[PDB]
From Swiss-Prot, chains A, B:
It comes from Zymomonas mobilis subsp. mobilis (strain ATCC 31821 / ZM4 / CP4). Disulfide bonds: none annotated. Belongs to the queuine tRNA-ribosyltransferase family. Homodimer. Within each dimer, one monomer is responsible for RNA recognition and catalysis, while the other monomer binds to the replacement base PreQ1. Catalyzes the base-exchange of a guanine (G) residue with the queuine precursor 7-aminomethyl-7-deazaguanine (PreQ1) at position 34 (anticodon wobble position) in tRNAs with GU(N) anticodons (tRNA-Asp, -Asn, -His and -Tyr). Catalysis occurs through a double-displacement mechanism. The nucleophile active site attacks the C1' of nucleotide 34 to detach the guanine base from the RNA, forming a covalent enzyme-RNA intermediate. The proton acceptor active site deprotonates the incoming PreQ1, allowing a nucleophilic attack on the C1' of the ribose to form the product. This is Queuine tRNA-ribosyltransferase. It is an enzyme of class 2 (transferase). Keywords: Glycosyltransferase, Metal-binding, Queuosine biosynthesis, Transferase, tRNA processing, Zinc. One of its GO terms (cellular component) is cytosol. PANTHER family: QUEUINE TRNA-RIBOSYLTRANSFERASE. The active site is at D93 (proton acceptor), D271 (nucleophile). Pfam families: TGT (PF01702).
Length: 374, 374
């Protein structure tokens, strides 16, 4: 019934857009938050719970999956969707970022990268061709081109070199994806803009990616230490360089205010790990800003994590109980914190979508920030 | 509507019985498996999931709760049921066993015991009066008398001394419970038979407890190293000493075959920790015996944990997936293993209840053992 891929914009306000991506496995409402699944699980949540929070799509980490349980093994078992029990779209990253951040003994070349697993020191390889193949074996719906990441800060020369290599690799990724009929006909492929903080390099990258042609365009290389002011400054000039009629995906971690500002700058998709990572460490998001539930001030607080949140956690349990669970190291604490935090991010996305649709997003952003930072 | 406490026996076969305990917060089907909640949580499960597995009642560990978050704190917050979100009956243990097993610097006397917390070395006290008070503060439905445990093996003299002290403490527990109107009118009190492996001491203990009078009678002091043959030998003579018309509660850990044999000997209630403890360590129960899901033989096994199990885990996920989760140390692995194992124990209890009701329990026990140990 549904097409391989169709992005439609229903409403706009300034640079912000709201709409839908239709794919074979489901519809994705945009702007979208895509919860992160590492090794075939969204931390401490059954897939049905992830869906109940409002997620339309989740991310799978290729690097983690190729190490454990293995890409070929997942294919033999019927693919990632079947394996983990999530039947809606899955976006897979290329594996490259985690190779840089997590792996050891990395050897980089124009062909790709060889590296040692951080788990057992076994040797592995990634390349544009192999990354696209692994994403095929997983049965990914949205496949990411394999690129070479640029650390922050980067000199103009190094940023240019890595961007140029990334563009050559974007073409190789495109060709690998297209040559595999089943993948080409059923999945989508996104390209990744590079260029660090440099406007000229960002423009060259956008031009190269548009010439190749992709179903969507990510902004890569941000959220890696430059800070919000600089990230926003780069997004100001970078997002307008990308094709307007395709989704714009900001890759990287983000707080609620990062998401709001990025949407104001034309971003349609987010993959923030913060709500799945920081939940078990005690951080809970609320409309009045984040709290750390471990703080002693919550030990006898009968209110829910957030006073307005519609999630199941906030309907049933108190701050006092969750404080106890997290302090005690109980698994249920991680379950409840993670469900609430992902649900909070999804409610943020719903408010963003509704406000853009109603032409009051700028007001929403101002009201959101005033209260969140009060 | 329902009474404070009413135990009714609907059917019998040999020493085995099936029936119901009616209490204000709900009906408990017997023979019953009562999943263990330590510090106000059944490991890795929301209360609704615990209920979905078939549990009618759960256990709360008094020792753990008095340390964290504290009994007075739980009372201030509205009681244990409200705190953790379980609205059905809760049985609380007295705290005594864990004082012996887990605490340090224990000082025992005829008055009670003082001890240091294993968490932070803070000093605490338990006595018949204080244990009953803590169970009141938690809002327990079934309160356990506070006793003095007897290690295995025990000399006849030491077993007699501890049994005699336990009987004096049973009277003190009875009086403390009765003097508190709200507790006496709404909760039930069980006494605990002691006497180690000695028939004469078990008889003296049963006589003392029956003279005092309780709503139910536990068999204490077993499942502590004597092994199944000896446990069954002691149950053979010990259970018939207890009043026939009240529930018989075996305190201690147990495998599926321990439960079946104990029911054959007249036990009505079980509190086995094994399914909540061993799940995250890899052990899954099946009708063909236990398996360890971490074993490499399961890495590509698409079958559910058990071929007949009706639990949600066995409807949705494969052995291969759960193998991966447990090997990877993922929280979802513990969630799924624990849900399946508790559900397996509940299905065992349902088959036991149905077979007794139908006068075919002896056949069920034989068939169960033949297959479980094949
Ligand atoms: Zn919530
Ligand atoms: Zn099952």
């Amino acid at each position: 019934d549904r097409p391989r891929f169709s992005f439609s914009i229903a409403a706009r306000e300034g640079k912000a857009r709201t709409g839908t991506i239709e794919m074979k496995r489901g519809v994705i409402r945009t702007p979208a938050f895509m919860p992160v699944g590492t090794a075939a699980t969204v931390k401490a949540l059954k897939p049905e719970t992830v869906r109940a929070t409002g997620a339309d799509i989740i991310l799978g980490n290729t690097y983690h999956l190729m190490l454990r349980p293995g890409a070929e093994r997942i294919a033999k078992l019927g693919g990632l969707h079947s394996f983990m029990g999530w039947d809606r779209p899955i976006l897979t990253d290329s594996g490259g970022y985690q190779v840089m951040s997590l792996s050891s003994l990395t050897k980089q070349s124009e062909e790709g990268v060889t590296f040692k697993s951080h788990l057992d020191g076994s040797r592995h390889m990634l390349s544009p061709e192999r990354s696209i193949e692994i994403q095929h074996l997983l049965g990914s719906d949205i496949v990411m081109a394999f690129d070479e990441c640029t650390p922050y800060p980067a000199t103009p020369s190094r940023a240019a070199s890595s961007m140029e290599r990334s563009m050559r690799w974007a073409k190789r990724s495109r060709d690998a994806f297209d040559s595999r009929k089943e993948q080409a006909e059923n999945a989508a492929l996104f390209g990744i803009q590079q260029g660090s903080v440099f406007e000229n390099l960002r423009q060259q990258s956008a031009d190269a990616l548009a010439e190749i042609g992709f179903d969507g365009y990510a902004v890569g290389g941000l959220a890696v230490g430059e800070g919000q002011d600089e990230m926003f400054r780069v997004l100001d000039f970078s997002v307008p360089m990308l094709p307007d009629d395709k989704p714009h995906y900001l890759m990287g971690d983000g707080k609620p205010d990062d998401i709001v500002g990025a949407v104001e700058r034309g971003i349609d998709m987010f993959d923030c790990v913060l709500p799945t990572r920081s939940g078990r460490n005690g951080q809970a998001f609320t409309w009045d800003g984040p709290i750390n539930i471990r703080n002693a001030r919550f030990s006898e607080d009968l209110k829910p994590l957030d006073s307005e949140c519609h999630c199941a956690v906030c309907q049933k349990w108190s701050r006092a109980y969750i404080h106890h669970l997290i302090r005690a190291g109980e698994i249920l604490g991680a379950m409840l914190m993670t469900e609430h935090n992902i649900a909070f991010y999804q409610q943020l996305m719903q408010k963003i979508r509704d406000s853009i649709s109603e032409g009051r997003f700028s007001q929403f952003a101002q009201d959101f920030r005033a209260r969140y930072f009060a």
